[PDB]
Amino acid sequence: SCPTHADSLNNLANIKREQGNIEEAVRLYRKALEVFPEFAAAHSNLASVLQQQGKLQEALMHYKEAIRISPTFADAYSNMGNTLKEMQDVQGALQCYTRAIQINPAFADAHSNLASIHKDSGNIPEAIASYRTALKLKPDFPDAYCNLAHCLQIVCDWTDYDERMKKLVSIVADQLEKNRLPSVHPHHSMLYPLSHGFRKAIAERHGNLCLDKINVLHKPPYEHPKDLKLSDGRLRVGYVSSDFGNHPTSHLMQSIPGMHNPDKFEVFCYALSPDDGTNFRVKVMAEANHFIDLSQIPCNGKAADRIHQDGIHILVNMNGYTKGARNELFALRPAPIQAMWLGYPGTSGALFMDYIITDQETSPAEVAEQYSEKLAYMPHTFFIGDHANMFPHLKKKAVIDFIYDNRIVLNGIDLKAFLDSLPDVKIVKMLNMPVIPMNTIAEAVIEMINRGQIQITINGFSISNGLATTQINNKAATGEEVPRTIIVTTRSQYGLPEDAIVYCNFNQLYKIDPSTLQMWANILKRVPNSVLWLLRFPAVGEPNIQQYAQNMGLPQNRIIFSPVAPKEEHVRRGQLADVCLDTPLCNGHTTGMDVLWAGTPMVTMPGETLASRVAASQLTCLGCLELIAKNRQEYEDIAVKLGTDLEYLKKVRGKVWKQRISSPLFNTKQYTMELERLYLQMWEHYAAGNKPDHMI
Amino acid sequence: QFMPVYQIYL
Numbered sequence A: 001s002c003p004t005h006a007d008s009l010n011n012l013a014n015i016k017r018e019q020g021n022i023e024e025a026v027r028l029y030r031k032a033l034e035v036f037p038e039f040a041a042a043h044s045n046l047a048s049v050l051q052q053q054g055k056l057q058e059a060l061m062h063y064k065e066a067i068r069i070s071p072t073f074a075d076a077y078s079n080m081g082n083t084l085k086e087m088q089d090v091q092g093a094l095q096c097y098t099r100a101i102q103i104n105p106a107f108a109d110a111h112s113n114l115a116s117i118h119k120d121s122g123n124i125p126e127a128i129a130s131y132r133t134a135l136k137l138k139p140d141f142p143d144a145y146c147n148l149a150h151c152l153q154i155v156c157d158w159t160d161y162d163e164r165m166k167k168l169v170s171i172v173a174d175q176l177e178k179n180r181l182p183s184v185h186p187h188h189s190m191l192y193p194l195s196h197g198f199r200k201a202i203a204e205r206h207g208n209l210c211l212d213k214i215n216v217l218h219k220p221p222y223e224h225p226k227d228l229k230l231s232d233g234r235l236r237v238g239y240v241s242s243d244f245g246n247h248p249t250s251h252l253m254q255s256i257p258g259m260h261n262p263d264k265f266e267v268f269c270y271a272l273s274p275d276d277g278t279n280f281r282v283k284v285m286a287e288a289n290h291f292i293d294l295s296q297i298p299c300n301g302k303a304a305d306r307i308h309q310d311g312i313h314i315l316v317n318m319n320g321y322t323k324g325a326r327n328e329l330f331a332l333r334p335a336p337i338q339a340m341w342l343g344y345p346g347t348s349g350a351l352f353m354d355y356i357i358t359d360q361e362t363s364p365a366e367v368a369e370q371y372s373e374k375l376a377y378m379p380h381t382f383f384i385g386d387h388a389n390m391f392p393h394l395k396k397k398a399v400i401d402f403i404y405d406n407r408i409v410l411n412g413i414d415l416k417a418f419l420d421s422l423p424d425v426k427i428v429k430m431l432n433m434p435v436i437p438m439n440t441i442a443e444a445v446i447e448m449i450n451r452g453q454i455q456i457t458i459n460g461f462s463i464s465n466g467l468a469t470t471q472i473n474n475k476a477a478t479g480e481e482v483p484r485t486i487i488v489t490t491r492s493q494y495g496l497p498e499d500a501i502v503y504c505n506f507n508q509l510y511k512i513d514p515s516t517l518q519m520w521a522n523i524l525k526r527v528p529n530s531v532l533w534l535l536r537f538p539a540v541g542e543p544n545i546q547q548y549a550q551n552m553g554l555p556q557n558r559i560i561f562s563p564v565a566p567k568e569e570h571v572r573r574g575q576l577a578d579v580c581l582d583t584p585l586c587n588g589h590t591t592g593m594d595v596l597w598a599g600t601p602m603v604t605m606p607g608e609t610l611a612s613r614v615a616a617s618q619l620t621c622l623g624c625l626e627l628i629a630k631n632r633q634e635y636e637d638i639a640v641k642l643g644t645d646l647e648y649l650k651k652v653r654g655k656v657w658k659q660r661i662s663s664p665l666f667n668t669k670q671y672t673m674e675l676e677r678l679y680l681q682m683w684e685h686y687a688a689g690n691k692p693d694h695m696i
Numbered sequence B: 001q002f003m004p005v006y007q008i009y010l
């Protein structure tokens, strides 16, 4: 039992760890702890390497031993807190982080970890403060700097934005050049001016973390099917998602599994998350051929075994590097063909994914180098929404003349019966828009809006206030049910001037960048009386956006903020705007479908990353190419023309209002059949004896 | 409470 002998083995393991050989490091750390057990450093190092192998319980054990041996070991506290956070023990993580700060007030890593815990809980102001404290203790701290950079992005804090972006690029440059895990998350990387190669390298590295966690399983490669004989001529497709529930993913594709052709396909749905009781989860469980709750199988080795023995041919990754992802399942390759579909707007960077389902308008062959996987093109757009199914009451509308189409709006499944009950109704032809003229009925509706009342009854029909949806029917409010009443939606509800062009953007404020606010300021200045409609998403960003708005010459009233609303109210109130200004940095993907379903045109400026070219692809599939701008000048000009030429605004709004139903954008049955065609191409390729290659 | 941001007049 020689401590110097164990010290030499410990340093030997540290070298082997720094050579990316986690298993040799493990062997030597345990070798050191067998020579001299009371070796606090060896316990913590073996804990760190076991933590990244995924053996959290064992890592926690060795962290406690190191802290027992030397209680002043603040580093073991913060790293034990990281282990507890990975175990969903946030309570214990806080105690570890705060006890480390108590023991060593100058220990920056504990402050940074405490900032991360606040960030994960939505406490962005407090996460910012703790990151700043950590950077004050340790100025060179890439994890603290990059995470703080994301927080400032979330709240639209653009102080020293240009210098920050350059520092982020250099940090990623260095970390990639030193074979270290980049401090920028791959999902965040599409917000900073990195090279496409930098982005792909970040994604590849975050995917190799999965390999480090599955290599400890020692699982042998699987035998994959080579035909459809056992499947009865059916192609077995497995959709893996942690978002079968009240998540935007289900809001886009919940009707897709039920629309597969049962003669050719067998649909497997693997939920990575437990049942949240929402109707989205109910619909997918009912309509899918099989539904497997992989959240009941934590072991990725066994969960991959379950997928393999189900006989999946094409396994679809709908998470990417997002919350709830379990891409270790895809790393064990239980299926012969593995593809990325919707949940992640980027490349996996890794080789356990073979394809990425996209379109030619979002992923052109020129930028086909930003994707590690091969490209699988869909006919028009890879993007789909379930708005035709979730919000059919928004299929037709009516207005009240106090003749705009977006000032006092009515929607309802039983609307046409109510309009026929009224004596005088004017039909503005275009299919057409009824107008309720000013009369005792209209007076009562406006009184209900003004008085703050929840609902009224007119000729026996239920007239509901658009702001009271959640107390009239909570599942109608969340989009789980179609409203059974008639809903009134006015500009006075949200403070929109009744005589103004209303530009809107209901995306999260993290997608706005200083240049985008500059373009919007230019557009608002050139269109007199126009307003910009944004959401408190988050609310702490509202003063920051307002501050930069004043700097660009816009007075206070030019930008109007409104609270975030339930899914149904959010989509319905998009009817009140005239034009939607999309965020060029990161396009509104689900928000883009939401605004287009309302019949509201959307000006976009496609970029180079997939995240920046989705809205353009949506507009191309819709059939509105005049809304797609090739540069900043054209983006501003298009929006100004829509805002100043009311006749042109009227024609384009009618164009969107009709092509939402006519174009394939919202036709889920078409999308599924084309998805099936692409699936069959991929299998024909593979069964012919071909490793994955581009599809068109 | 569902009051509007401003009110619509006669």
Ligand SMILES: CC(=O)N[C@H]1[C@@H](OP(=O)(O)OP(=O)(O)OC[C@H]2O[C@@H](n3ccc(=O)[nH]c3=O)[C@H](O)[C@@H]2O)O[C@H](CO)[C@@H](O)[C@@H]1O
Residues within 6 Å of the ligand: A247, A248, A249, A251, A252, A342, A343, A344, A345, A506, A507, A508, A535, A563, A564, A565, A566, A567, A568, A570, A586, A587, A588, A589, A590, A591, A592, A594, A611
């Ligand atoms: C950059 C990014 O992360 N993009 C993803 C995002 O689209 P996208 O970026 O458009 O959407 P978000 O992740 O920001 O989520 C916004 C969601 O909140 C809803 N909402 C918004 C405002 C409001 O007042 N009320 C309300 O209910 C929207 O209808 C939408 O469902 O989710 C999609 C669904 O997985 C993915 O396909 C996209 O790749």
